[PDB]
Amino acid sequence: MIRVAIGGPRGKMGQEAVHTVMNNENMELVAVLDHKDIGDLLSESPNFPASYEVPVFLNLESLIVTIKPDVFLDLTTPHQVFEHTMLCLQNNVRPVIGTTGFTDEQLQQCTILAEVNKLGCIVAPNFAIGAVLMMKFASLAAAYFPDVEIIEMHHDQKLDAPSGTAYKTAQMIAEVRPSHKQGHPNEKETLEGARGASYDGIPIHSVRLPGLIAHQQILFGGEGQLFTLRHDSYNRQSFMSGVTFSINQVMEIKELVYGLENIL
Amino acid sequence: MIRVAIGGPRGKMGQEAVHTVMNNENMELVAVLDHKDIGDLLSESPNFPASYEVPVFLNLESLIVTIKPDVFLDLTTPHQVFEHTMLCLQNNVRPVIGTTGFTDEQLQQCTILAEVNKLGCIVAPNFAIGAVLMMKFASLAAAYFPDVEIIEMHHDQKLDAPSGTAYKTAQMIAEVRPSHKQGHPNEKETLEGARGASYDGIPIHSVRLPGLIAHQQILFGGEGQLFTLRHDSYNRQSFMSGVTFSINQVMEIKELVYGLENIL
Amino acid sequence: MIRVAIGGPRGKMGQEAVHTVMNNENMELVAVLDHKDIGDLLSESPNFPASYEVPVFLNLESLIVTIKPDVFLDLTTPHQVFEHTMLCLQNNVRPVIGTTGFTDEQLQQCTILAEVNKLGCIVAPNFAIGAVLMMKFASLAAAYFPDVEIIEMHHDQKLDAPSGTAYKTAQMIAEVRPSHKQGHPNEKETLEGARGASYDGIPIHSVRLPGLIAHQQILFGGEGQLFTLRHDSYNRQSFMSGVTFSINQVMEIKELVYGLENIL
Amino acid sequence: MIRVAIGGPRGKMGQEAVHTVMNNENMELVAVLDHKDIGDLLSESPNFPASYEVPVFLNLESLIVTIKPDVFLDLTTPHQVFEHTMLCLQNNVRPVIGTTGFTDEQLQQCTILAEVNKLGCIVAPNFAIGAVLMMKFASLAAAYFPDVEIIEMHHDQKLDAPSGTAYKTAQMIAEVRPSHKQGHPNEKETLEGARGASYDGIPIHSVRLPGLIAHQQILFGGEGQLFTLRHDSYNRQSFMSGVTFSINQVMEIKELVYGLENIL
């Protein structure tokens, strides 16, 4: 059985994770770390619901000594992850961190402390197992098919192109793929931009339409063939089998692992 | 029965058309208009094969008076189509023209002459019925889904991006779709080119990989849905059901029609 | 301006339609026809919310005389549509019916009455414009590509295979496509069922997975090419541009139209 | 440099392999093993072309002693592979076998002999790297997404459904995926066959159309997401990067490897 506490239960990711943890047969949600803005009207922004089973704490120190969870799932913000991770790792709690955060120096302090205490920690910048396998498998495939393109498609409210997942995908592929540009050397755009963006010579195209959520295809060309990997995320439940896997696996490892590609 | 003569039988399109006409139950190939470069070694560049059934002519005047074909399928070059079309239309031969050619003034002379002689003429810049239906249907769909993107994919020897078919597709859609840009007004590329090219606000993306031949997808977004039209051409047989349809239909019309979208 | 009343506002389709009508600039939601089961606890099943702008009626007679809506959008049940449609058509209200209902005889009474009163009526068994265009366009395409397959994909709670939309698609195509079977005459299944179901010789395949919502692809083969039409519905907002179109168009027609393919 | 001899150079696979070996910078085609049917008119069925560089042998014993190739690529028939493989392995030639062949007992004799002689042998029932990676990656993915479907699409002259590649894919997945059926327990087909074939509960669907060559998609469902692997083969050049990889890698291994999934 794994007793889980969640930091940031009211967030978009947090509300899904609450549901996932409560519904996983071998997990029990035992506490949350939460606090609202001082200006939040309860009418607009309700409190996390009061229960005996899931008390709400405002600070992690207090949660840990009272509840002694097995696992802390941190769905807070990049400014808070280092102090939370260090606190867990000194108190025999396995932290599972969903974040874009940590400095180099901060991550090295966490890594060393997890190692000496023989305590697991997983830092997952992308919990969605389909996305992570897409990227992991693309990087293995690029040893055999060095000509590749990435097409990513999102809703039309998204502010950044290309997506973070496409940039990460291109970085992973570029660890394996020899650096080169693609397309005939003499090709020329007659409408500026037709060929897309380039990362290390890898073309990346960004589609933005109503109706779409989050989608990526990776297209590997070679003589006489096409090999394609695709991930479609229709909602934030897409991230939950990575949350589940991370909570299960953190219990079994004795060091810090950064990125789910390193343990799937 | 329709007695067909072919201009340019040794060309990439011509060799397919020869096969198609010979194998269509209701057509007979009765002559070809052909000539080689004065420097063509027969070892490299064979003559069209000699037969009693399919004589070879060097000029169209001579073909027409000797053979009196029902239909002339012109697979020659843009510099020759006007004189060929005029000659047919004055000699009771229905011309079917595969070309990017004609000036405005030339096409108006052909149109008027076909009309007065009550003789059909089809000019087809794209014979592939799947491509033409893709475009025709996209232009009807754009009345209901004004947010659309085009993704075109070709082999990596292609020199121009975007493809002619994508440009034509975008022009057809823009006849119906109100002019607007797409994507959040505040979106910004962090890798130049990610959002593609724009035609009248329609994004167009160009993929260039080994293995691919010629492919296009048109993606129509709206709330809660995606509607997609796609054409894949694996070889030049893709153009042959348009060749067949044009030869059949030219016999039945009494005026010049430019573009297969206007008669499918 | 079009003053709209909705029958069945708490239904899955109804709740979306309420939102759509309230948010369309040229429509005003002026009333609902609604009633709950006598055993519905308000705690489980709330009343439609009380407002001055949108009164709730238990019977349509009463709604019509008090509110005199321009359009009645019926999202009730097959047992109620005939009496509702007849009542509208005698009271100068344009009915827009979302239903699998009507008998032959019932529909003929509605058709005749709409015609004599010069009043529009639309009956839409499928409001999703992308789905309906998919089917309409497939039926036009089947004149040129008689070899076709349908692949439909839904969530894994769905009880019927194939879907109603696939059956309707196959019926529409079969109006145009000559009846024939496909696949080599000597082909044999070594694992029973591999080739799918057949409707008039058209193969139909049904995919059932978690994660999927409602999806269909129609694949048209021919020499050297593939032409594909696809619709993806991610949520019930997919049906709302047909609801909007129907309410707009019913005002402009003077007879009953059955199926949106007949007016898009 | 690797000196390669090819068995069966005039076969569909053989003619591609001849080209591939001749064009690979580090390979030299040094001989072929070939013979025609006694009834083959040279007019219909030409001899492999005569050259000093690539002599033609009728038996492998004779080829091996005269030419002493590094690698023998066997593109012959299942009845001949065992005797060819044994002969190579006793004569310091690395055999690379493209076949559906070998008995259990035959393969064990080859395995043992390769091991004692510290000589590489690769037996590849599927040379296409995209196909093999598709299958290998699907089997890894099935540890995280146990609900999966296979859709395979081929030309309409194919006699068997499902394809061998789909059957192999399903067998590979079933090594990892817990055995279960999919779809609602109460689902019912209203048109027989809609749900496809089942292998260990894995649904398999077979599409047969003109225009298609050889295609497979593997669809992995889970909450809120879809993860898809796809391979498209447009021609027999699709198999050639596996031929190249096998010839390179056989030189580096010291035992027999059956199936490219075991060394990619």
Author numbering:
A (entry chain A), B (entry chain A), C (entry chain A), D (entry chain A): 1 to 264
What did the paper state?
DHDP reductase (DHDPR; dapB) is a branching enzyme associated with two described pathways and that reduces DHDP to tetrahydroDPA using NAD(P)H as a cofactor. To address these issues, we determined the structure and characterized the biochemical properties of DHDPR from the psychrophilic bacterium Paenisporosarcina sp. The results of isothermal titration calorimetry (ITC) and enzyme activity assays demonstrated that PaDHDPR has a strong preference for NADPH as a cofactor.
The final 1.8 Å high-resolution native model of PaDHDPR was refined and obtained by molecular replacement using the initial SAD-phasing model. PaDHDPR tetramerization was observed by analytical centrifugation and through generation of a crystallographic symmetry mate. The final model of the apo PaDHDPR monomer included 264 amino acid residues and 296 water molecules, with an overall topology comprising eight α-helices and 11 β-strands. The N-terminal domain (residues 1–127 and 235–264) responsible for cofactor binding comprised a parallel six-stranded β-sheet surrounded by six α-helices. In the tetramer, each C-terminal domain formed a central 20-stranded β-barrel structure surrounded by eight α-helices. In the apo form, this loop region shows a relatively high B-factor as compared with other regions. The apo and DPA-bound forms of PaDHDPR were in an open state, whereas the DPA/NADPH-bound enzyme was in a closed state.
